């Protein structure tokens with residue numbers, strides 16, 4: 507089942523040691539993906555520790571990329587924090 511993280515938890519995972527981000531209320535651990543992302547490391551770094559949904563959507567991402575992203579899900583944003591960012 508669901509493992510939840512608050513915004514304040516996720517915020518700490520903002521650097522090379524541990525990079526997490528949020529897309530559509532899911533929490534992604536990208537620590538090892540940074541080196542692999544076709545769009546490069548820096549754009550991810552820029553977003554690390556918070557909601558990156560609109561940047562992810564704005565740039566565009568293929569169905570293949572969206573399927574790939576599910577492999578990094580570690581949990582979901584706590585329900586009480588959903589109103590403090592958009593799904």
Ligand code: HEM
Nearest residue numbers: 534544545549550553558561562565566567568571574575
């Ligand atoms: C777990 C999440 C992510 C996955 C799996 C992922 C995967 C990919 C993949 C596979 C591509 C190659 C093109 C495509 O398939 O559409 C791509 C390109 C790109 N990604 Fe991501 N991405 C992720 C998150 C992000 C985020 C959050 C941003 C921005 C902050 C970003 C910015 C870019 C850029 C700028 C490109 C280049 C677009 C192009 O090829 O022309 N990505 N990403």
